[PDB]
Design a protein around this ligand. Structure first.
Ligand SMILES: CCCCCCCC/C=C/CCCCCCCC(=O)OC[C@H](O)CO
Ligand SMILES: CCCCCCCC/C=C/CCCCCCCC(=O)OC[C@H](O)CO
Ligand SMILES: CCCCCCCC/C=C/CCCCCCCC(=O)OC[C@H](O)CO
Ligand SMILES: CCCCCCCC/C=C/CCCCCCCC(=O)OC[C@H](O)CO
Ligand SMILES: CCCCCCCC/C=C\CCCCCCCC(=O)OC[C@H](O)CO
Ligand SMILES: CCCCCCCC/C=C\CCCCCCCC(=O)OC[C@H](O)CO
Ligand SMILES: CCCCCCCC/C=C\CCCCCCCC(=O)OC[C@H](O)CO
Ligand SMILES: CCCCCCCC/C=C\CCCCCCCC(=O)OC[C@H](O)CO
Ligand SMILES: CCCCCCCC/C=C\CCCCCCCC(=O)OC[C@H](O)CO
Ligand SMILES: CCCCCCCC/C=C\CCCCCCCC(=O)OC[C@H](O)CO
Ligand SMILES: CCCCCCCC/C=C\CCCCCCCC(=O)OC[C@H](O)CO
Ligand SMILES: CCCCCCCC/C=C\CCCCCCCC(=O)OC[C@H](O)CO
Ligand SMILES: CCCCCCCC/C=C\CCCCCCCC(=O)OC[C@H](O)CO
Ligand SMILES: CCCCCCCC/C=C\CCCCCCCC(=O)OC[C@H](O)CO
Ligand SMILES: CCCCCCCC/C=C\CCCCCCCC(=O)OC[C@H](O)CO
Ligand SMILES: CCCCCCCC/C=C\CCCCCCCC(=O)OC[C@H](O)CO
Ligand SMILES: CCCCCCCC/C=C\CCCCCCCC(=O)OC[C@H](O)CO
Lengths: 408, 408
């Protein structure tokens, strides 16, 4: 039942597409823009998968296989992967679904990510991976209806508690925090509440179906890409994860075209290709070193309550923060217009607020943008700045105009 | 002596850079625009290498190693490789040296050209190659000071003659043809005559130095790429032609910057990356099938007088001609302006011809270009149409204004 990875992955892309689900931007905007929309989306799913993974394993739909603990691997590979995120312009999974979105930079970013991961795994970088392998923590769980034989450590296994107990506690706390905290609001119809339900459901669909083929794990990104490159370059048979990668690329493309969001897109300056190639290049090193990326360790490993995924997840954000500071330091009169068409995700938001605050009272400020997400984030980032959005105007195919009524 | 190829390639890039020597355009412009500048550079070098190769074989610096004849592989793969040339925006070595210039579409084309060649060699296309290999002609020469043991057939070996005779007859006919024939004029200072001298001197240096490494051949491009990818993705040792692949890029990189020609380049519309993406794939499949590319069979094999290299070099032009039809079917007032900045070199020349033809007597035509070659090819294409070029201007570094006074 190997084709089911394409089936799971096809749903995976559509959830990631219409839900804007990118983990690198989620970590960045709690540090840059104090924006938590995608964190509650993460926290909600993680809580739901916590109960889901144990519940599905309890009945007999899966067994959990936590990743083995490697402090040198989880810490250092976690940080290397965090750097690649901001350099690659998106997470490991985010770039993959971005390929079907028509992002030439995502093609370039994905091309090196698989190659470097291949090189880190078996290629010329295999010395650095084999050296880190001398820090493998031998601590293990034992075979049960919960855990595969010889798997890694968990919160439960250390504590001697039955896995239900921390899973019910932590998920409830997360559900409390996400439901009890103020949220920065956008205008995505596939809002973070329902979107987390689908994301956890597909993950549960991922675990049960992938285990049938022989792969005892949920959603993964690095393992599939390496399997794709191998099959194309050494004629090895494709498996569930590589097919899942294929379904993701198709899945994001289908919805992007149905919504009318699809476009072959170029960066504003040609130097960005050199940047995003390095970004994925780092990600291949870090993801392979840590044993998984923002999906293989975070989305699918954190709700499994596994120490190795929990430890590796930490430095995903440290690198996400580290590379962020290095890098990111109708007739309506219009008083000043600023053109941000062709700019990557944070730029339209960054220069829109730089216009209204460096403007007097009563200014009409025009914002010209050609990317879908920015027309939903800009209206919120100006309401707290006192001002008001006059009208969101639809100009050319895929371009929107925002007129701002500046206050004080 | 593996390192000598980076040196040979380093010279190779500078020769290819300042002479603009791309074989895909050499074949293309004899059918499109009846322009023979680059073919003149080709035929002379073939003659010079016809004499050079046999001369060095006589003393003991080298031996000729013609590639064995396979009628299925040379014809079909040669045709397909010709399709990939036009699609990939240039020949096999024609993108590689262009990587050092700063062209992002060549980086994309290089990514698919290498990976397809690795796939067609041992990856997912090994079935096609394994089937094609059953048609290998068992005609072999014998170990001698002129031919390596069990090599392929040649014009000389077929006729029962000494290698000097066909080399001295065919090269003189090439030399007589090139010098007695009309040549389309350019303003490349590194003219076709001297550049043909240096291109054989590098080619001969490639033979003598590489033969000591254990590879008994001169400049070969597709074989070089696979050695790099094997090393990077399988931790295999690099080799002479793998280093030669690097030296071409590093050699052109030095030459592209000193002349002030370096610039990170993007196409006009994002669609070109997918078009050039297929081009590298076709070239990899074609070059591995053909057993040699624009350099492996034409530049290096044709002067060796080998039957297989001639046969594949016939169909390189047929596929080049096939795909060419599918794809291509200051105070000066200025009366009409034409902007072709960012479009590949044929387009500025063609769109400059379209303006003058659809212009009346006395109109001043402004043509803005951002590629150095077009500022050389346009002035000859304007005097051919009766008109006169007024001044070549320097707007921005790397951008030129061409002012044309049209006659009738
Ligand atoms: C603030 C949160 C709001 C929502 C809250 C939802 C709570 C759901 C579960 C809680 C478990 C609490 C601890 C229960 C301990 C039970 C121990 C047990 O059954 O066994 C103990 C021993 O280890 C073997 O017998
Ligand atoms: C017990 C086995 C399962 C354990 C795991 C699942 C736990 C689900 C519940 C968590 C808290 C949900 C309610 C959180 C508060 C929601 C409403 C809110 O934010 O405040 C409303 C206010 O308290 C009044 O008006
Ligand atoms: C645990 C067992 C699970 C078994 C079942 C597995 C699959 C579950 C859900 C899949 C939803 C896939 C489609 C999600 C919705 C598509 C996107 C959407 O809602 O788009 C709205 C649009 O953006 C408005 O403008
Ligand atoms: C063993 C001895 C024989 C084997 C080795 C023979 C090497 C022959 C040439 C090497 C590099 C030539 C590079 C091209 C010349 C310099 C670049 C040039 O021509 O630049 C002109 C410029 O464009 C004006 O503005
Ligand atoms: C990892 C590298 C992956 C590389 C490949 C990723 C997927 C590319 C998908 C679509 C582009 C081709 C279709 C869109 C072409 C431009 C749109 C257009 O002009 O119209 C097309 C439409 O079909 C009316 O004819
Ligand atoms: C027990 C589990 C309970 C939950 C199981 C969920 C399974 C998936 C169902 C629906 C996906 C989301 C569908 C709704 C998303 C928004 C659709 C919408 O607004 O559509 C607008 C329209 O397409 C243009 O105007
Ligand atoms: C479109 C681009 C996504 C990648 C598509 C190609 C990825 C590699 C597929 C591959 O390995 O194909 C060979 C075959 O699977 C050996 O059994
Ligand atoms: C991995 C292998 C499978 C490839 C996926 C296709 C990805 C792209 C999705 C399809 C392109 C959609 C498209 O071009 O839509 C028309 C466009 O809007 C112009 O009219
Ligand atoms: C091998 C097993 C099969 C694998 C392959 C199956 C392909 C099925 C195709 C399409 C269905 C899903 C289409 C989902 C389209 C996105 C939803 C959406 O956005 O539509 C509403 C719109 O946005 C409002 O403006
Ligand atoms: C338009 C441009 C056209 C350019 C020219 C294209 C010529 C045909 C090329 C490839 C198809 C090959 C199909 C047949 C392949 C071999 C059939 C066969 O017997 O394959 C056995 C197999 O390899 C083990 O079982
Ligand atoms: C053995 C190599 C001989 C090379 C020289 C061949 C004869 C000179 C060429 C004259 C062309 C006509 C010029 C007018
Ligand atoms: C035994 C054989 C030994 C062979 C050893 C190598 C011989 C060839 C070396 C150089 C050729 C000329 C190179 C190009 C020189 C002219 C460049 C030109 O046209 O102009 C350059 C000038 O700097 C513009 O300002
Ligand atoms: C796997 C294969 C790897 C192959 C690797 C080969 C070596 C590196 C290649 C080319 C370097 C080219 C460098 C060109 C630098 C140009 C700098 C320049 O001119 O920059 C202008 C700018 O204005 C300044 O601020
Ligand atoms: C002035 C414009 C250019 C400025 C500089 C641009 C960057 C140069 C860096 C490296 C180039 C490659 C050469 C150095 C490395 C060669 C490969 C090597 O070390 O090979 C070892 C061994 O022979 C096989 O593994
Ligand atoms: C491994 C690290 C490598 C670091 C980098 C090493 C650079 C070597 C320097 C010079 C060789 C090439 C000399 C220049 C050849 C082309 C000259 C040129 O541009 O000729 C036109 C002329 O300048 C118009 O006035
Ligand atoms: C293997 C590839 C090695 C690549 C090594 C770096 C190449 C030059 C990079 C940046 C300079 C950009 C300068 C600004 C744009 C051109 C003017
Ligand atoms: C031998 C297998 C491939 C043979 C056929 C090549 C297919 C891809 C390119 C077609 C033209 C696309 C651009 C058309 C522009 C008008």
């Amino acid at each position: 039942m190997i084709w089911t990875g394409l089936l799971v992955g096809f749903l995976f892309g559509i959830v990631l597409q219409r839900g804007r689900i990118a983990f690198n931007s989620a970590f960045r905007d709690v540090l840059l823009f104090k924006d938590n929309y995608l964190f509650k989306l993460a926290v909600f799913t993680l809580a739901l998968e916590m109960i889901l993974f144990v519940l599905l394993s309890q009945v007999g739909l899966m067994q959990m296989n936590p990743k083995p603990l490697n402090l040198v691997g989880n810490i250092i590979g976690g940080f290397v992967f965090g750097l690649g995120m901001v350099l690659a312009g998106g997470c490991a999974s985010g770039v993959t679904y971005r390929v079907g979105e028509g992002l030439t930079t995502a093609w370039f970013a994905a091309l090196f990510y698989g190659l470097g991961a291949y090189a880190t795994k078996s290629g010329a970088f295999s010395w650095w991976l084999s050296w880190v392998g001398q820090f493998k923590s031998p601590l293990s769980v034992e075979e049960s209806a919960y855990y595969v034989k010889g798997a890694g450590p968990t919160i439960s296994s250390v504590l001697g508690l039955n896995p239900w107990i921390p899973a019910l506690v932590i998920a409830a706390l997360f559900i409390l925090w996400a439901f009890g905290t103020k949220t920065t609001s956008r205008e995505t119809k596939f809002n973070w509440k329902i979107a987390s339900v689908c994301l956890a459901l597909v993950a549960g669909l991922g675990f049960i179906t992938s285990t049938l083929s022989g792969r005892k794990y949920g959603l993964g990104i690095t393992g599939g890409w390496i399997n794709l490159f191998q099959g194309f370059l050494t004629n090895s048979p494709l498996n569930w994860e590589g097919l899942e990668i294929v379904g993701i690329i198709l899945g994001a493309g289908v919805a992007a075209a149905v919504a009318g969001e699809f476009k072959l897109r170029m960066p504003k300056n040609p130097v960005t290709y050199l940047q995003v190639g390095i970004g994925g290049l780092l990600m291949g090193i870090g993801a392979v070193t840590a044993g998984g990326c923002n999906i293989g360790h975070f989305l699918t490993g954190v709700p499994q309550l596994a120490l190795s995924s929990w430890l590796a997840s930490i430095f995903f954000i440290l690198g996400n923060w580290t590379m962020a500071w290095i890098l990111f330091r109708a007739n309506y009169q219009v008083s000043k217009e600023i053109d941000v068409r062709g700019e990557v995700c944070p730029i339209p938001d960054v220069e829109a607020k730089r216009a209204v605050q460096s403007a007097n009272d009563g200014e009409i400020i025009l914002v010209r943008i050609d990317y879908p997400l920015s027309k939903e984030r800009i209206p919120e980032t100006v309401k707290k700045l006192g001002s008001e959005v006059l009208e969101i105007e639809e100009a050319a195919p895929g371009e929107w105009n925002i007129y701002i009524k500046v206050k004080k």
